[PDB]
Write a protein that binds this ligand. Structure first.
Ligand SMILES: O=C(O)CNC(=O)C(=O)O
Ligand SMILES: [Mg+2]
Ligand code: NI
Ligand SMILES: [Zn+2]
Length: 331
């Protein structure tokens, strides 16, 4: 078995290997990359996403989210308070202000220490989940707006044509902006490109051990767990590496820098935080290997998780027994 310790693997494809996206994902899996739940892909030196980032300041962040924490430093939830619209140029200035800017630090490990010590005492503002793309239309390789769609994959594998669309999302971050522990909708893959700015630190649980994280989360968030049998779908719970280690949960960590891709694999729980002002682009995708994960994915039906239009067909076709209850949660 390749990668039996489930380590995060880093890949350096050549420009020739960067042509065929599906083929490269399958290659990474042949080497055991998926066992970690997360892989890094460093693009060939010849590649670029676009020519420059000098002209992005007028993008609008219609609903910036203030991420307010509750709990203890290593075990907390966050809720999202909606703020007034602002441009990316305005958001960048805010991220760099004295109230929000990254503190002085020695290295990524010192900054990680500071994040886990102090995150709960601040409420950073995240420009998350903005439909759009920063890839140039002429970028032919690993262009996250030009990937094969999940609807087409399901149709190719299973023969059923379905409604729905699959487009990317932009994320504008600042120091301490946080992504809570989650797997993707329908335990899909994700791919994330860090276009510009400061790093993003990731934590990940191997897919084969995801239920260990779920059991800890039920223990640590006992009211939330009574409320919903899949409450991590709400994307609000944080647990620190120190707490994971104390509870024997297998995990790994890695820091993504500008110009790098990360892929999350089906049922790979992940969480993390941004180091400072940055911009990422991410999208879900599928492969043949996903279908079995999609069929088994948990679902939130309590009403909290509320998701895209396109998840309807995935549930309807892959999980017909669950469909009626899940759809009630949507309505
Ligand atoms: O970058 C973020 O805030 C969160 N991203 C992801 O969870 C992802 O790409 O799957
Ligand atoms: Mg602009
Ligand atoms: Ni994710
Ligand atoms: Zn729920």
């Amino acid at each position: 078995a390749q990668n039996p310790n489930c380590n995060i693997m880093i890949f350096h494809p050549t420009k020739e290997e960067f042509n065929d996206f599906d083929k490269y994902i399958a290659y990474m899996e042949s080497q055991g990359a998926h066992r970690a739940g997360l892989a890094k892909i460093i693009p060939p030196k010849e590649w670029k996403a676009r020519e420059t980032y000098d002209n992005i300041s007028e993008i609008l962040i219609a609903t910036p989210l203030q991420q307010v924490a509750s709990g203890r430093a290593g075990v907390f939830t966050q809720y999202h308070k909606k703020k007034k619209a602002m441009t990316v140029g305005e958001y960048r200035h805010l991220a760099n202000s004295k109230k929000y800017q990254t503190p002085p630090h020695q290295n990524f490990e010192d900054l990680e220490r500071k994040y886990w010590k102090n995150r709960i005492y601040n409420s950073p503002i995240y420009g998350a989940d903005i439909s759009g793309s920063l890839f140039d239309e002429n970028t032919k390789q690993w262009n996250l707006g030009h990937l094969g769609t999940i609807q087409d994959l399901l149709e190719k594998e299973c023969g059923v044509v379905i409604e729905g669309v699959n487009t990317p999302y932009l994320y504008f971050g600042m120091w301490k902006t946080t992504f809570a522990w989650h797997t993707e909708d329908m335990d899909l893959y994700s791919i994330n490109y860090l276009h510009l700015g400061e790093p993003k630190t990731w934590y990940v649980v191997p897919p084969e051990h995801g239920q260990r994280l779920e059991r800890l989360a039920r223990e640590l968030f006992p009211g939330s767990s009574r409320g919903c049998g899949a409450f991590l779908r709400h994307k609000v719970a944080l647990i620190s590496p120190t707490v994971l280690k104390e509870n024997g949960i297998p995990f790994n960590r890695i820091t993504q820098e500008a110009g790098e891709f990360m892929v999350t694999f089906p049922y790979g729980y992940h969480a993390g935080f941004n180091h400072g002002f940055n911009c990422a682009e991410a999208i879900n995708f599928a492969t043949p290997r996903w279908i079995d994960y999609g069929k088994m994915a948990s679902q939130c039906s309590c009403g909290e998780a509320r998701v895209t239009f396109s998840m309807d067909a995935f549930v309807r076709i892959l999980q017909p027994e669950r469909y009626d209850l899940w759809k009630r949660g949507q309505d």
